[PDB]
């Protein structure tokens, strides 16, 4: 399961948002992102290149913790 950071997600709209936009990913599954741990879990075997991207393109800051 791939690990991620991200950075400015201060409501619960900006993580459903951010939810869905990396299940837009070829290869996403399922996902777990919290708000209070900055933290998006991906189960799928996607790369995190193309997740990381997927956040960032909604605005807000992320990185791999891979």
Known sequence: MLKLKVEGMT???????????LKKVPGV??????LE???AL????????????AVEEEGYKAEVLA
């Open 42 to 53: 991906v189960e799928g075997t996607a790369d995190p290149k193309a997740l990381v991207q």
């Open 11 to 21: 409501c619960n709209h900006c993580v459903m948002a951010v939810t869905k936009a």
């Open 37 to 39: 741990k900055g933290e």
């Open 29 to 34: 599954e399922k996902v777990e992102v919290s």
